[model samples]
Target: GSSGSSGADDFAMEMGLACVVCRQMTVASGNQLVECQECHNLYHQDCHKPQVTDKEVNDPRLVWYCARCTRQMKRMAQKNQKSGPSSG
Candidate 1:
């Protein structure tokens, strides 16, 4: 019989799973991955769909999001704002 693991351990393990973008398990050789500042999600450079070049990754103006999650997040934010406090 084994004891259950801690929540922190689970969270760390989940973070190591494949990124939600290009679906790759890890970054390509020599490339770096970064977490989306807005959502706190991790993504590899190559794994990011539409494929940004190495130079563009560091651009301040670039908007980074996993395609599907971006759409969902935007839709939810819009709905919440439209509903406003009065709706609740």
Candidate 2:
């Protein structure tokens, strides 16, 4: 673990990554993006908790929520309150 940096950090730093929400940022670039939706928050059709599927991104029936959101929502429900989507 004492090894110095090499192709690893270089690759991560040099990666052409843009639209992480999708394969690349091109297909969804024309419309511009938001600050909140600029990260690995988007999930797959799996977990189905603390996250959502890419397809469900626009599915009204589906909602987005991170781990903190999930917990906050649960606790809020206990207090007869609601906890909407949250991000950091």
Candidate 3:
């Protein structure tokens, strides 16, 4: 069994638990639910509208932005504060 060091492999299945703001079906709101690292869209933790606390939902290097990417990231920071940072 040498060189067969295949580490931890588990199984998971969560195909769109469905909760785009109160549409329901995230197991009828039990484990909360959160997933929108930019357009992944699947919220239910109090139907996310810029308030999903509990330390950023038990922070695992925190990354969750619903409400249409948090208003599209504040309109791209107000379009880089009135168009000033974009060179491409």
lDDT of 3 by residue, 4-67 (tens): 6656654332444667777666443234777777788778777776656666766999888876
Give the top-scoring candidate (lDDT): 3
Q: Pick the candidate with the highest TM-score.
A: 1
> What order do candidates take by TM-score, descending?
1, 2, 3
At residue 42, candidate 1 shows an lDDT of 66
**Global lDDT of each model?**
0.61, 0.41, 0.67
lDDT of 3 at 79: 42
**TM-score of each model, in listed order:** 0.44, 0.30, 0.28
Off by over 4 Å in 2: 9-40, 50-55, 59-63, 73-77, 80-88
Q: Show how many residue pairs clash in every candidate, following the order shown.
A: 0, 0, 0
As for candidate 2, its clashing pairs are none
In TM-score terms, candidate 3 sits at 0.28
Candidate 3 segments exceeding 4 Å error: 1-14, 18-38, 45-68, 75-81, 84-88
Clashes of 2: 0
